[PDB]
Amino acid sequence: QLTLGNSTITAQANSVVAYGRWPEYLRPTEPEVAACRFYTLDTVSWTKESRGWWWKLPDALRDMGLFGQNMYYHYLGRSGYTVHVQCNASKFHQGALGVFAVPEMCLAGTSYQNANPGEKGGTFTGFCPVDYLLGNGTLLGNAFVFPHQIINLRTNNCATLVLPYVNSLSIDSMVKHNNWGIAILPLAPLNFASESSPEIPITLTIAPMCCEFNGLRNI
């Protein structure tokens, strides 16, 4: 049970701090608990046919209350994250997910309505980015260079990524530039014993860390 403000998720596969750098305050504001909640996005049902799901940050949290109303009513904004994927599955389900935190994730198969979906996330394909190349024109095998983790449904079912603020500028407008990108890809397709539940849910849980906004826009 976590302690971040109003929201608490029951979490029992250890944290994978991307690039070995913890998100730290710029050396602004200090939202404290204003936005540092655990915004549990909607769950996506992993099935035997699904090919992938791609979210983008902070675009995913563009409607999440205080964070959404702080990144949109400011001008400069920086914040790390603590993306946390959980795939609730029983002992009779087999599979493996790869969670990749793709900085500057340019899924060039690009209108702003196609590359910034938001809470819905997206879906790769075999807008239809190619899963085989991760949507980046590059073989999926190399994708493991990106700070990632593997959720194998016989050793663990949760994966935590601590994403720091990675951007060419020390602080950038959160409404235009998507620093990171979370791509979940089935490495080994789901399979299960007969009559078991045929679609296991996956829940992301983003917790903005060390968020700082500068500027303001009235209203």
Binding site: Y19, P103, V145, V166, S168, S170, H177, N179
Partner: protein, 194 residues
């Protein structure tokens, strides 16, 4: 005992390689066509080797070391004995006006640095420092307006006056990125994508 100091960023990247072949020519005294001043916007996205080597990473900070190899040839059997051509090689920094004529003020403007090269001597050479607004170049941009980092432009012409020889010339530009740092490794793009 091995070293490992040959897979360093500077060792991997600090290799000169031709990035363009700018064609100019000294107009004939008949003035059939005016000077063909050659203008080329500095961009690494035309050489497969350098681009591919730079797409292993997201952000980079590399200082350029341009160098120019000048060659020329008469287009007619008659020699004409044109006295050694003098080439003006102007580096138009990022944002400055782009020359549009062989007699535009931009050639004479004070801001744009220029090199004067007499055909025959050792190759010209400059070193454009890290010229960028942000704190690191970006080869992949996930944002939208409201990548394509501007390094500047190179405009080359022949200062000499018209002579009835039609002396064509081709300046080869070699770019050696030095003092290069790179962050955020990425998967390498296939060689067919360029």
């Amino acid at each position: 005992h091995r070293s490992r100091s040959e897979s360093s960023i500077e060792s991997f990247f600090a290799r000169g390689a031709c990035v363009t072949i700018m064609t100019v020519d000294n107009p004939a005294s008949t003035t059939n066509k005016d000077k063909l001043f050659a203008v080329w916007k500095i961009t690494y996205k035309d050489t497969v080797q350098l681009r591919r080597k730079l797409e292993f990473f997201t952000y980079s900070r590399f200082d350029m070391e341009l160098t120019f190899v000048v060659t020329a040839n008469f287009t007619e059997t008659n020699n004409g004995h044109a006295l050694n051509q003098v080439y003006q090689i102007m580096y138009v920094p990022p944002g400055a006006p782009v020359p549009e004529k062989w007699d535009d003020y931009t050639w004479q403007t004070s801001s744009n640095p220029s090199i004067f090269y007499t055909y025959g001597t050792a190759p010209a050479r400059i070193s454009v420092p890290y010229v960028g607004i942000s704190n690191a170049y970006s080869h992949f941009y996930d944002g939208f307006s409201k990548s394509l980092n501007d390094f500047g432009i190179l405009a080359v012409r022949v200062v000499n006056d018209p002579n009835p020889t039609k002396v064509t010339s081709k300046i080869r530009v070699y770019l050696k990125p030095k003092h290069i740092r790179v962050w955020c490794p990425r998967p390498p793009r296939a060689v067919a994508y360029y």
